[PDB]
């Protein structure tokens, strides 16, 4: 038997987190070989049992969808019981950890009437989203994802960094985070221009005045996705901050 | 068999989906508990 782990994304971020945590959890006890592939890998096993054990391990940390197919090796008669070659297709959700997502309309209305223009916030057995403009959270299971799948709007490689010119912390806080009125300037714009951008970020306490932050920039971007073209363009912000670039 | 009932069919004898039907369900779906606010034994 073999399991074929795939993720249809260039930057295999959750895949790299998974191959990091497999050495912590030590799930590679029965691996015959580790073959590479186009965008995932293959684990090979001499029995169906550790294939099911590896899938049961992946289904506790990774949002997956898997099948099982078979090839008849040899039909051995006098018993009627042939032997088998089994192949499992473990496919990860293609939304990584800090990804700008435009959710479907009825899906966004289903999960708590969240805003349609969200970030991803945590990858686990389920996929967690986050509104940046209000501290609002939603959860999407892999089974509900794969009925009508969708891909992220902008990858983590589309991030451009900014300089935090002001933090106004006059927002409403949930746990571990706090809303703000952060005034940022892009560090290809300050030094030549003199203009800024106001955002209601969820990084209202993680970054102070002056430091470098990293986020998406919608105003210069050029998207082609029907979910984004259905959005009201008067309510999509210009900047979405995702993470602080802590220099050390 | 699945012609005869919403509960029918299968390789084991199980209902499969939730057996509390809705109140606004049509005639032919109402096979179970019709507008069940509670279910189950309370304490005994």
């Amino acid at each position: 038997a073999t399991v074929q782990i795939r993720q249809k994304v260039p930057h295999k971020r959750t895949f790299l987190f998974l191959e990091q945590l497999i050495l912590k959890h030590n799930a590679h006890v029965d691996t015959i070989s580790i073959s590479e592939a186009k965008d995932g890998l293959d684990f090979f096993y001499a029995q169906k049992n550790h294939a099911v054990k590896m899938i049961d391990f992946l289904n506790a940390v990774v949002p997956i969808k898997h099948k099982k197919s078979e090839e008849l090796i040899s039909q051995d008669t006098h018993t009627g019981a042939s032997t088998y070659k089994f192949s499992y297709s473990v496919e990860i959700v293609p939304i990584c950890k800090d990804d700008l997502v435009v959710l479907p309309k009825k899906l966004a209305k289903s999960m708590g009437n969240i805003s349609q223009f969200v970030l991803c916030s945590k990858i686990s057995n389920t996929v967690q989203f986050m509104d940046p403009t209000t501290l609002q959270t939603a959860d999407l299971s892999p089974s509900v994802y794969w009925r009508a799948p969708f891909n992220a709007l902008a990858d983590v490689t589309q991030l451009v960094e900014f300089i935090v010119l002001d933090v106004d912390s006059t927002g409403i806080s949930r746990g571990n985070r706090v809303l703000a009125d952060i005034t940022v300037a892009r560090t290809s714009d300050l030094g030549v221009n003199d203009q800024v951008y106001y955002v209601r970020s969820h990084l209202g306490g993680i970054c102070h005045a002056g430091d470098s932050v990293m986020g998406y920039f919608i105003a210069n971007s050029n998207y082609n996705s029907d979910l984004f073209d259905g959005l009201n363009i008067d309510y999509v912000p210009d900047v979405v901050l995702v993470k602080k670039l802590y220099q050390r | 068999n699945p012609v005869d009932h919403p509960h029918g069919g299968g390789n084991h004898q199980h209902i499969g989906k939730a057996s509390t039907i809705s109140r606004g369900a049509v005639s032919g779906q109402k096979a179970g508990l019709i507008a069940a606010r509670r279910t189950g034994l309370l304490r005994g």
Binding site: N220, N222, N224 | -
Partner: protein, 94 residues
Amino acid sequence: VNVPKTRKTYCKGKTCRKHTQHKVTQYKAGKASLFAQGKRRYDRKQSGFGGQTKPVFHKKAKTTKKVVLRLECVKCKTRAQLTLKRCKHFELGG
């Protein structure tokens, strides 16, 4: 990509017919009015029984758009349309 907010291009205007100076902007599509002939015909075909009668395109594969620049001559206000390649980022060099 980046483009300057102005460029000296050939103006096809009747009074100019020369290299004048154009202000460039990005072209955004119109509002897709409701009395277009293929909208009146579509509504008349959709009204009734029969369900969805026209195909609804689903299998999208592109991830960018072609950038169209609208160039307005400063002399005679005649406009032209250039097109660039597909890019993911596009701003104007103010």
